[PDB]
């Protein structure tokens, strides 16, 4: 079983978005009014699941083949998962989901008028390698209109879920694409107060990782809470 051998650097709650960000309407009723109660890290918080023995399908990370060829811009989304100390996070679970080239999600609740793509699902999963590297093959999603303000549009984005070494490091985020004009107008993006934090959410064009005459590539690195050994406890 797991063992309490690590400590994780305290989260910076001024870096991450706050709970109550009124321009993001839904956050109003779904944010706690009482302050969070801080607790010391115990085995409960410093351990988490290891997905090394999960039975991944051969095309789990290939959205092009996992659901005809989908219509849209063929891209590779790759990067590395490191900790705050810059140490790689190997054998970790990275899951993603997104819309099709038109901004339509393959979900019951999605009633946006753009049509579904018969050959596109929009889900993938990848376990990072020894070096903390992951990669997905997909099509670039399109902007999505949503009922917030009267004319709100989500920038093209990919949802990401990362496990890390413990439930303390587990994170859900979104990737945005370099140069997208919608980025700076998005209420959700704006939930993040520091422009420098927003920058970490933008995937950069990576021509070096592109396959000529085939597909482009985007680089997205993820930084999880720094892990250290206990000391003088």
């Amino acid at each position: 079983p797991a063992q309490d051998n690590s400590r994780f650097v305290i989260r910076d709650r001024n870096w991450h978005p706050k709970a109550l960000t009124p321009d993001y309407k839904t956050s109003i009723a779904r944010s706690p009014r009482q302050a969070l109660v801080s607790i010391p890290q115990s085995i409960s918080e410093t351990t988490g699941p290891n997905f090394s023995h999960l039975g991944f399908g051969a095309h789990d990370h290939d959205l092009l083949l996992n659901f005809g060829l989908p219509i849209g811009e063929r891209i590779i989304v790759a990067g590395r998962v490191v900790d705050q100390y810059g140490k790689p996070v190997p054998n970790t679970l990275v899951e993603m989901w997104q819309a099709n080239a038109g901004g339509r999600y393959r979900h019951k609740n999605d009633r946006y008028l753009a049509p579904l793509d018969p050959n596109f699902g929009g889900v993938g999963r990848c376990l990072t390698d020894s070096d903390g590297y992951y990669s997905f093959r997909t099509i670039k999603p399109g902007p999505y209109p949503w009922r917030n303000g009267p004319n709100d549009w989500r920038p093209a984005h990919i949802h990401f879920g990362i496990s890390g070494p413990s439930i303390a490091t587990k994170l859900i985020t979104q990737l945005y694409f370099e140069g997208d004009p919608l980025i700076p107008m998005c209420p959700i993006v704006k939930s993040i107060a520091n422009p420098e934090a927003v920058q970490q959410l933008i995937a950069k064009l990576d021509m070096n990782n592109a396959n000529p005459m085939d597909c482009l590539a985007y680089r997205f690195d993820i930084v999880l809470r720094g892990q250290r050994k206990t000391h003088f406890e």
Partner: protein, 200 residues
């Protein structure tokens, strides 16, 4: 001071989170292996229980698109990190609330006692992470059992909560479903009876 690399900022899971983490619920075909709400196989040791609950918003309305992740020790108070569908018991599971009734369920066993960093035993508990649209950064809570009052009173964690009345929000109420032992654990994100959320 010393500054490390900043952690990647959190973003709301969104209302379509199911497509990625709750396939069945999205109304999409699943893959061979999925992480779901059945932590224990019927042949697993310990006291088998069924957990269920609802999630309320600040207006008292149901949150029907919420997603939850759980982490708990086995009946021996041990964390089984090596996730495998073949195991009789897994420490980790995922669940979600019905778009209709808006209730989540989990099939597991009552967790054994674990000690804190100082060597003090914590009352049996289940660690919960709540994700959902309108939630910028996930909420951390713990589920405690009402039939463990003795242990609960001495929990180092429960005891960090200043107001006794707030500690009650973390106590699941024992019941029975189809003649099976069940515990109801409702989460109130905001307002009257607001549940205790942690930072660690």
């Amino acid at each position: 001071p010393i500054e490390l690399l900043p952690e990647t900022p959190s973003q709301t899971a969104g209302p379509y989170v199911h497509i990625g983490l709750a396939l069945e619920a999205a109304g999409n075909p699943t893959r061979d292996q999925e992480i779901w709400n059945r932590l224990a196989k019927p042949d697993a040791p310990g006291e088998h229980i069924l957990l269920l609950g609802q999630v309320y918003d600040g207006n008292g309305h149901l949150v029907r698109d919420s997603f939850l992740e759980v982490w708990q020790a086995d009946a021996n108070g041990e964390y089984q990190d090596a996730y495998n569908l073949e195991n009789a018991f897994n420490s980790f599971g995922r669940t979600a609330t019905t778009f209709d009734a808006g209730e989540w369920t989990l099939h597991t066993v009552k967790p054994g006692v674990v000690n804190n960093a100082a060597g003090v035993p914590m009352a049996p508990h289940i660690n919960i992470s709540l994700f959902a649209r309108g939630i910028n950064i996930h909420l951390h809570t713990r589920l405690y059992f009402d039939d463990e009052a003795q242990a609960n009173a001495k929990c180092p964690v429960l005891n960090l909560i200043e107001q006794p009345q707030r500690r009650e929000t973390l106590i699941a109420k024992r019941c029975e479903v189809d003649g099976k032992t069940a515990y109801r654990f409702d989460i109130r994100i905001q307002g009257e009876g607001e549940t205790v959320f942690f930072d660690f």
